[PDB]
Amino acid sequence: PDYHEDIHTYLREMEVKCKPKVGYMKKQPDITNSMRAILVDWLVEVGEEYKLQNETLHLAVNYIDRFLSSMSVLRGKLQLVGTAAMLLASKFEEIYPPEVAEFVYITDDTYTKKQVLRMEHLVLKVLTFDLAAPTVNQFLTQYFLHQANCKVESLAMFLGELSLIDADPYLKYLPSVIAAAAFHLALYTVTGQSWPESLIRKTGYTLESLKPMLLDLHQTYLKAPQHAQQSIREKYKNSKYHGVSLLNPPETLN
Amino acid sequence: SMENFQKVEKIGEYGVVYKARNKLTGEVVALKKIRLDTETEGVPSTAIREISLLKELNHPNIVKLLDVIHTENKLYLVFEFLHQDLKKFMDASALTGIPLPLIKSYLFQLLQGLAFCHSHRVLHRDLKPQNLLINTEGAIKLADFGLARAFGVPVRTYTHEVVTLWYRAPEILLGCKYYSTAVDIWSLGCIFAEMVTRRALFPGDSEIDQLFRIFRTLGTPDEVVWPGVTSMPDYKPSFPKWARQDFSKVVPPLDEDGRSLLSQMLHYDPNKRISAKAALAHPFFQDVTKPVP
Numbered sequence A: 001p002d003y004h005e006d007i008h009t010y011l012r013e014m015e016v017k018c019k020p021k022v023g024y025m026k027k028q029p030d031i032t033n034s035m036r037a038i039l040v041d042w043l044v045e046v047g048e049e050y051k052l053q054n055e056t057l058h059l060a061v062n063y064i065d066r067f068l069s070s071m072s073v074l075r076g077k078l079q080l081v082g083t084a085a086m087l088l089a090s091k092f093e094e095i096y097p098p099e100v101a102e103f104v105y106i107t108d109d110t111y112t113k114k115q116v117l118r119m120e121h122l123v124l125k126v127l128t129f130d131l132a133a134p135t136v137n138q139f140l141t142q143y144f145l146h147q148a149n150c151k152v153e154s155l156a157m158f159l160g161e162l163s164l165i166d167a168d169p170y171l172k173y174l175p176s177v178i179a180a181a182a183f184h185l186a187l188y189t190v191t192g193q194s195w196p197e198s199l200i201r202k203t204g205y206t207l208e209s210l211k212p213m214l215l216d217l218h219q220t221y222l223k224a225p226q227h228a229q230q231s232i233r234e235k236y237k238n239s240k241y242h243g244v245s246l247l248n249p250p251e252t253l254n
Numbered sequence B: 001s002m003e004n005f006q007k008v009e010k011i012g013e014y015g016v017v018y019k020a021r022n023k024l025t026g027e028v029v030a031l032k033k034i035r036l037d038t039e040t041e042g043v044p045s046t047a048i049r050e051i052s053l054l055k056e057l058n059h060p061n062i063v064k065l066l067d068v069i070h071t072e073n074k075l076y077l078v079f080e081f082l083h084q085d086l087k088k089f090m091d092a093s094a095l096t097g098i099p100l101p102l103i104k105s106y107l108f109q110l111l112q113g114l115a116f117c118h119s120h121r122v123l124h125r126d127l128k129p130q131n132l133l134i135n136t137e138g139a140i141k142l143a144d145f146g147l148a149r150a151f152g153v154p155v156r157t158y159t160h161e162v163v164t165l166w167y168r169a170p171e172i173l174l175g176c177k178y179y180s181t182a183v184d185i186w187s188l189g190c191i192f193a194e195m196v197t198r199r200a201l202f203p204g205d206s207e208i209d210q211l212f213r214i215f216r217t218l219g220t221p222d223e224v225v226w227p228g229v230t231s232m233p234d235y236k237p238s239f240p241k242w243a244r245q246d247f248s249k250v251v252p253p254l255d256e257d258g259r260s261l262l263s264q265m266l267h268y269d270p271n272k273r274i275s276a277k278a279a280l281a282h283p284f285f286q287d288v289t290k291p292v293p
């Protein structure tokens, strides 16, 4: 309606305030980028088992990167931070959230129920109750209106989801920028078209400004079948997403 | 913590509400106590939504949250104190009625508060006289965000069990797959007429009765006034066919401009139902002032 311009402007304002530290992993003595990739891949599987929204997944990752920007954590307690973050994101976004007892179950007897409940309250304090954050997913649904191929949409969310795995180098790009590159790249792979005129007038992003981001994402697509993480590729094999993870990537983009 | 506050009296019952006083500064406030489920489910989702969304909104016509106090077993919310709610004010004016300029003033401020909400992607979903507060100067503010939600563009399928029955929208009663900002506008429409006629517009006592009270007044809808109405999950061809009636009998005291605005807030098709932003420009508000109660 007449609000979607006011909302888009407001979202561009809040994504700056809700951004994590770019170089936090260098200051964490006991954990690495490799360990973080393992945690995110596991959270993807959980979303499939209990059938949760894709927005819920994006919210949980945001909470985790902000918490680890402020507090030191040992490798043995890393899974406990992830479990409580996925629970908070469910209460905020889902119509029917899973009960606490089921979050205890999927950790396979590693932690107790009393431990999960206490970590929930600590995360709320550290973030000062600020939970309504913009995501890559939120910007993509607005971009979709400027088309209506349903296969281009599935491939677009596929590329965007892959970025959550690797802190290097995607922690230095804003969500709106990541959305822009993922859209144009999926559009050039399926049909062969490009970043629409209408969106240049809306976002103010040109194809030149998206260049450093787009070249990074292009390489991630090519080398995907050999990444140590594979939970995302198998998810988008399903016909519910039109089996988009089987298409071959283009060789050049000009 | 709480050693600086002194309680005066209990206000009502979410959680429990008190009126209290700051011992060192002299400020009067309102305290809302919430208990945590330490051995079971933890912090309630209604409290999580209410606190995170209210911290973003700052407007003269929206109640202000001052502080949040943590405790191992409890939460305390600290609000500004206001003098009375609208429902109690309407009962005190049962014999004389509410002056027209004051009705015009109150409604104008309510629309300014709602426009700010929708501009920041927030739905209220519980607008009624008991959740609206006034002071001794002529102001009015929105309150109780315990049923609120942040939406997206475009929307998804959300929770179906929403809004107090007397103030519920027709699209919800028919079990729609998608709803949005149009449901908040409908609630303010029923509130407008209640201020004028000194009684509720559609006081139904069941889900099926509520729907029929609307039909006998606005007329039974068809595909001409509401395209796609017969595809709703709870539509039935056995519905009786009543005819629309005159607005000169619905709201007698209202004049030309007032009746023009009312019929746009109660449109059947949510697409054509007027928005809060566009309503602020209607000719009815050409001479708006600010009286004192």
Ligand SMILES: CNc1nc(C)c(-c2nc(Nc3cccc(C(=O)N4CCOCC4)c3)ncc2C#N)s1
Residues within 6 Å of the ligand: B011, B013, B017, B019, B030, B031, B032, B063, B079, B080, B081, B082, B083, B084, B085, B088, B130, B131, B133, B143, B144
């Ligand atoms: C609907 N639930 C509410 N929770 C809070 C914290 C509310 C609130 N209440 C007030 N003040 C208030 C409300 C209702 C009644 C009286 C009251 O004591 N009287 C009214 C008649 O004259 C004398 C006695 C006071 N202010 C702010 C909020 C908020 N937020 S309502």
